[PDB]
Design a protein around this ligand. Structure first.
Ligand SMILES: [Mg+2]
Ligand SMILES: [Mg+2]
Ligand SMILES: [Mg+2]
Ligand SMILES: [Mg+2]
Ligand SMILES: [Mg+2]
Ligand SMILES: [Mg+2]
Ligand SMILES: [Mg+2]
Ligand SMILES: [Mg+2]
Ligand SMILES: [Mg+2]
Ligand SMILES: [Mg+2]
Ligand SMILES: [Mg+2]
Ligand SMILES: [Mg+2]
Ligand SMILES: [Mg+2]
Ligand SMILES: [Mg+2]
Ligand SMILES: [Mg+2]
Ligand SMILES: [Mg+2]
Ligand SMILES: [Mg+2]
Ligand SMILES: [Mg+2]
Ligand SMILES: [Mg+2]
Ligand SMILES: [Mg+2]
Ligand SMILES: [Mg+2]
Ligand SMILES: [Mg+2]
Ligand SMILES: [Mg+2]
Ligand SMILES: [Mg+2]
Ligand SMILES: [Mg+2]
Ligand SMILES: [Mg+2]
Ligand SMILES: [Mg+2]
Ligand SMILES: [Mg+2]
Ligand SMILES: [Mg+2]
Ligand SMILES: [Mg+2]
Ligand SMILES: [Mg+2]
Ligand SMILES: [Mg+2]
Ligand SMILES: [Mg+2]
Ligand SMILES: [Mg+2]
Ligand SMILES: [Mg+2]
Ligand SMILES: [Mg+2]
Ligand SMILES: [Mg+2]
Ligand SMILES: [Mg+2]
Ligand SMILES: [Mg+2]
Ligand SMILES: [Mg+2]
Ligand SMILES: [Mg+2]
Ligand SMILES: [Mg+2]
Ligand SMILES: [Mg+2]
Ligand SMILES: [Mg+2]
Ligand SMILES: [Mg+2]
Ligand SMILES: [Mg+2]
Lengths: 261, 181
RNA sequence: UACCUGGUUGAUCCUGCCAGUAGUCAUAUGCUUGUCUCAAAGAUUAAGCCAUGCAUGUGCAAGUAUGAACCAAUUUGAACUGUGAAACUGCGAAUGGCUCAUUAAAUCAGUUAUAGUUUGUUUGAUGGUACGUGCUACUCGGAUAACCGUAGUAAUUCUAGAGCUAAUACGUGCAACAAACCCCGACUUCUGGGAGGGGCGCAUUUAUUAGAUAAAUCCGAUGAUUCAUGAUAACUCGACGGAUCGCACGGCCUUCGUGCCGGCGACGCAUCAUUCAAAUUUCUGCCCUAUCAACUUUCGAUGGUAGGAUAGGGGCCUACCAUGGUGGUGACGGGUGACGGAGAAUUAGGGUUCGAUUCCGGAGAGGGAGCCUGAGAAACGGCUACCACAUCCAAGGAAGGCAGCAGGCGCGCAAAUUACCCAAUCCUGACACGGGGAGGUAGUGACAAUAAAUAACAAUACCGGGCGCAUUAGUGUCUGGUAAUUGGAAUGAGUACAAUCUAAAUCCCUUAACGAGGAUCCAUUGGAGGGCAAGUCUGGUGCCAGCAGCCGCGGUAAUUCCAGCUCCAAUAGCGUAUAUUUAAGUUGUUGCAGUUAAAAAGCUCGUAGUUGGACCUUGGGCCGGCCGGCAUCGCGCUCCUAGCCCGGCAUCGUUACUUUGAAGAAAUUAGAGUGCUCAAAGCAAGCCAUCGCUCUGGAUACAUUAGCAUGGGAUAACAUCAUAGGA
RNA sequence: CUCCGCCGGCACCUUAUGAGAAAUCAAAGUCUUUGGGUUCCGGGGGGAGUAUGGUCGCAAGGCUGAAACUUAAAGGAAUUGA
RNA sequence: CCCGUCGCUCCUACCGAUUGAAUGGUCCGGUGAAGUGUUCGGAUCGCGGCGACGGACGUCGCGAGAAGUCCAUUGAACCUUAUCAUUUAGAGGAAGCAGAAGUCGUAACAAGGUUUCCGUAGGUGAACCUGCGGAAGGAUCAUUG
RNA sequence: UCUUAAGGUAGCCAAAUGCCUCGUCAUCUAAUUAGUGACGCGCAUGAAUGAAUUAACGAGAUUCCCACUGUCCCUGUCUA
């Protein structure tokens, strides 16, 4: 082409949106934003698809034009704003809060929470480096750039981030022994504990992560995101506690729910 | 153009050797005895039978302790037991292979209606099904090939509207009453 | 369903083909056609040619409104008020739609890289100095649309001149410290100094310098950077560093003065990061052809150095230098009725063939070429020139590009309406609102695909087999049927209210009153010698007419032609033609053949290729319920994992092979759940009091090769202990 | 010269438990129970080893080598008769 | 049963004087539109200094700047010669096939009446004949007879 | 069938060899008694009277084509 592309045809959309292949020719094209448009969920989907506060593309438009919806602390009018991992979606009119985290099946969930968990998010740092006049600052994987961090926060670490004062209020030093949620691949969502990290000079490094109930799996360092120091999380895990399972097991669970029903 | 993406498929296959007496009379056995309209009705059943037998045969090449064996086999066995196409104690997935075209043709809505009474013939049953005369649970099922499940077998009955099990009389019945009056 | 049958003979067993037999999301054609659901459709020949119409514009409370209107209408101090059209300004029109002509490691796919680049926008952070002799900001420019009015030209968003008036358009111009350090440097005293006052935002270009170790105070990053970043010396005729716009009021005087404040926001400039992206870029992989064995190199072919250009690497280009680069592992060249992939048909497996087309990548807009604007274009619903084709002209000139949607001509075996709408999906703009031939809806539509009518039940029957007496009988059982026999029941094809449906319509799905005697509400297409299912029927013809895929039929008694009758197969479908798949173990990897059926080279040598004897313990076992974990006569560990002196250590040969994992676009394939009434489908839906909500789902797998990581180390490759230059 | 044994040759005879369509074959055997290695070569009968291009030769010719078209058989082994 | 020449009819392909014909592509050479950048150029247009002169001028301030022009670069397009490839005409020559109720013989299949056949060479209306070497696919599996 | 010592073989051709003859067919041209390629009942071709070919060569004969030109249309002018 001779420039950018502004359309997203439905069959080409990320599979984890669960859009239906006959519901129309196009999909919502994720606007440029803090998340990488293949690991995001736009606002249109959250309202009309999941929450069903709307029935059409135009109805979700109106809702934002009343400004009921706030994302990550700030009011967003954009229809296709790219919400992502560990954002907060809050509707003060209804008085509800959500974190965005993954199913074990690797799909975003709106995890309902109180106000006290809305005050903060978690972010992993992309890099820490000097800048104008040697003033230290850090990149996150959320687009954010925080200047003047602890000299302890190195690359790949994770930070607590108050949305009111906006600076680092805590940080986890990414290393072996903490709990992590995976944000890509076939293992995305699966939480567990770093058991080993083997590096390879000139390539990606592999993380070894084990479910609380024994099952062992591996990803590459890109798709890893520490939640808490040690076994305990610093956020509320979703409806399933990050433990992925065989197809037989959920078959057993239904009939086990179908013997009581 | 969307709606191009919708799928469609084929349901039957014509026989390789068109004209052989032994195959040909065996087919008329089934067609007449189950009250069918044409050989297409029977061929689609055999095509669907061959599908599961290939499925069941494929798992039987896999071994026990295979997750696909375990998961796929039970789902197939449930599907067979659910439609009654497999007796009790028959849960080995070697008896799916033994399954025949008779069994599928004895679970059709047409054949079950006759086996329950209500019809006086197999050929009466069908026209009795297409004339809105028979519901199943609460819905007027008007396809002679409905393939009734076991759980819905008890509720097969007349409609709540059809003169023979429902409400008011038919056109010819009202016509004769008005000409008398 | 991992399958065959007819034809060489007097007969036989073979070889071997011809012919039959099935499908095609595979095209045309013929005959026929009632219902429901579904949906392909000018690709094939001509990337041939186009009449007409449409497909791209856009406005907020938040750039500019006395230019002329509209509605308030004024108490006639101020308002152009509140809403506005036009118009200037900003942004967009580089996406989508269409097609497949050129294009054969090329596009493309998986997989890499950018430390070798640009990136409007989003999101986050960030921002002093303009001159003042840095001793704290230094003043406000005309002229242009809409409008008024004079005009020319046949001419069209052709065009000239005069009169006004706006800016977030254009051009200027105020600028925030200790100056933090650095260089001069009157004098002071002697300096290791104090120094009076002169020189320093951010960008840009160049140069110098800093950015630290290794065991008996060194302090950011990478696998790896003269990296990030800092200091210094200057250099630029600097892109920059706000003269912009909204509502809301509401604390309090300093002159009680729209009075000092001070808020939230709209737009805008600049650096870094991010995001949406591209541009190049690594490895491997593509059909047929040798009656295509050499190709490239003067004039870029392969490399070197210095430049130039680019956004940036690079012979990309220039000057000088060297003589390289590719090739039987097929270079170079030719063919392609050749865009690539995801995929499709067929499939016991292995395969064979197709892939213009709705997703992704690329390329083009009649053929070439060159450009402007812009963040982004070598753009064609932008321009400039030429080539071809053609329109108007008042004859001087002017205006062009349907491989966008519809439609016409042509070409052909071969393909729809010059319809409605932005309601859904989304996109776009200054925007909640405008627009969208994207896209959706309807008409045509037997391309394919689904479900499914054309009767059912009864008794009479001249009758027909058993079964109750079986004898001698007779009828009577499932009604098997000629039966325009007879009797009422069933119902939709149809038609019609309404409702629903829908952007509005129509169709479906519901459903008031009509809607069946069999002549009608009537089902057809191919066959009846064999292959192959079904006539030793009857009339005609007489090697004629014809049929016949093949074998064959027809010369006066034709099972084969032409007909009637009857039967056969499939059935709302069926026949024909052509390409392809199967059959075909007649392309043979699995898996064929070569004495005589086709086929061992006259014979030997020989390079490449292909293939290649044996041999090196993991052998004899302790251990706990296939395996860890170990002792035998198991080359080390300091450095990470490191047990209560200790397992389980990294470099001092390379690989295939296998094991497990990663990361792998979706759609399609397989496959779970789910009663769209079934099915093809879809991705839903199901329970609640099918009551102010509850419960949710939207699994999972295969993915040849190449690349990445993990264990194994049987097998098999290449390399290599005898100058001991070994440990 | 006679007898016995081994190795290596040219063959012959008798027989299948073998193979083959058979004639025959102790190699044409160890083949649907299909895999030792490797080279050449066939794909119904003709047209045709022809045309054309290349190349070798003094020439005669050699090597490489189609197509259009045509046709239901051609052919192999064995049987009975004539 | 069967071969070939010849006569007749049709079909397909071959050679072939004709510097044959047409079409499309490519190499080189000549001319070369338009754009882009460069060089001069400077129509007129902006403080409209000064002289402090009387809306008028020249000394003018530098800054904008058109038509044109200069040299480079990209480069359509046209023309000549050549070459390539694909079609197509041709007096005449000459192959194969098929048809038909034709002419000449008798080559082959039996010892086919001269056993057949392979290579080569020569000769003849035609099938063929003959020389030389070879084969049995022979009409001999055989001489201690 | 008459005859001869033998009856002109391979080849070649309206040829520098063909009377008829400006042979017939094709090609070159606007038009060709010319040229080239074919045909061969050859007045009267033909094999060291050598037959048929043939690259290179030729102040040898002949036909055509491009260029060139006062050869020509059609002459004029200049110098010795
Ligand atoms: Mg978007
Ligand atoms: Mg097969
Ligand atoms: Mg024969
Ligand atoms: Mg016969
Ligand atoms: Mg066939
Ligand atoms: Mg596009
Ligand atoms: Mg920003
Ligand atoms: Mg260089
Ligand atoms: Mg360079
Ligand atoms: Mg093409
Ligand atoms: Mg095409
Ligand atoms: Mg066109
Ligand atoms: Mg383009
Ligand atoms: Mg263009
Ligand atoms: Mg157009
Ligand atoms: Mg069109
Ligand atoms: Mg008929
Ligand atoms: Mg017939
Ligand atoms: Mg037949
Ligand atoms: Mg039969
Ligand atoms: Mg036929
Ligand atoms: Mg025949
Ligand atoms: Mg017949
Ligand atoms: Mg007949
Ligand atoms: Mg064979
Ligand atoms: Mg042979
Ligand atoms: Mg030999
Ligand atoms: Mg070798
Ligand atoms: Mg490998
Ligand atoms: Mg011996
Ligand atoms: Mg063959
Ligand atoms: Mg052959
Ligand atoms: Mg032979
Ligand atoms: Mg024989
Ligand atoms: Mg003879
Ligand atoms: Mg003889
Ligand atoms: Mg003989
Ligand atoms: Mg002789
Ligand atoms: Mg002669
Ligand atoms: Mg002559
Ligand atoms: Mg002449
Ligand atoms: Mg001549
Ligand atoms: Mg003479
Ligand atoms: Mg003479
Ligand atoms: Mg003489
Ligand atoms: Mg001479």
């Amino acid at each position: 082409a001779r420039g950018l592309k502004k359309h997203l045809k439905r069959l080409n959309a990320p599979s984890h949106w669960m859009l239906d292949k006959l519901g129309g020719a196009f999909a919502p094209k994720p606007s440029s934003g803090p998340h990488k448009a293949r690991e995001c969920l736009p606002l249109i989907l959250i309202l009309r698809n999941r929450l069903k506060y709307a029935l059409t593309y135009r109805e979700v438009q109106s809702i934002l034009m009343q400004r009921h919806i706030m994302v990550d602390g700030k009011v967003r009018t954009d229809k296709t704003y790219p919400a992502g991992f560990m954002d907060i979606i809050s509707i003060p009119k209804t008085g509800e809060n959500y974190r965005l985290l993954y199913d074990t099946k690797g799909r975003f969930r709106l995890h309902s929470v109180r106000d006290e968990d809305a005050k903060f998010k978690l972010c992993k740092v992309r890099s820490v480096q000097f800048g104008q006049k040697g003033i230290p600052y850090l990149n996150t994987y959320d687009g954010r750039t925080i200047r003047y961090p602890d000299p302890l926060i190195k690359a790949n670490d994770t930070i607590k981030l108050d949305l009111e004062t906006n600076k680092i209020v805590d940080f986890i030093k990414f290393d072996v022994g903490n709990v992590v949620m995976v944000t890509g691949g076939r293992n995305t969502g699966r939480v567990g504990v770093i058991k080993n990290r083997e590096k390879h000079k000139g390539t990606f490094e592999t993380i070894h992560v084990e479910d609380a109930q024994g099952h062992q799996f591996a990803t590459r360092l890109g798709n890893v995101f520490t939640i808490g120091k040690g076994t305990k999380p610093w956020v509320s895990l979703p409806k399933g506690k990050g433990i992925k399972l065989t197809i037989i097991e959920e078959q057993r669970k239904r009939d086990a729910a179908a013997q009581a029903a | 153009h969307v709606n191009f993406y919708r799928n469609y498929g084929k349901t039957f296959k014509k026989p390789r050797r068109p004209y052989e007496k032994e195959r040909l009379d065996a087919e008329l056995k089934l067609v007449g005895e189950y009250g069918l309209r044409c050989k297409r009705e029977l061929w689609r059943v055999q095509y669907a039978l061959s599908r599961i037998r290939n499925a069941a045969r494929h798992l039987l090449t896999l071994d026990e302790k295979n997750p696909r064996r375990i998961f796929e086999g039970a789902a197939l066995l449930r599907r067979m037991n659910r439609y009654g196409l497999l007796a009790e104690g028959q849960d080995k997935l070697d008896y799916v292979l033994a399954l025949t075209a008779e069994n599928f043709l004895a679970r059709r809505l047409q054949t079950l209606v006759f086996k329950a009474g209500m019809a006086k013939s197999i050929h009466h049953a069908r026209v009795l099904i297409r004339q809105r005369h028979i519901r199943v649970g609460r819905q007027i099922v008007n396809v002679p090939s409905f393939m009734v499940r076991v759980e819905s077998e008890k509720h097969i009955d007349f409609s709540l509207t059809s003169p023979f099990g429902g409400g008011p009389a038919g056109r010819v019945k009202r016509k004769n009453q008005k000409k008398a009056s």
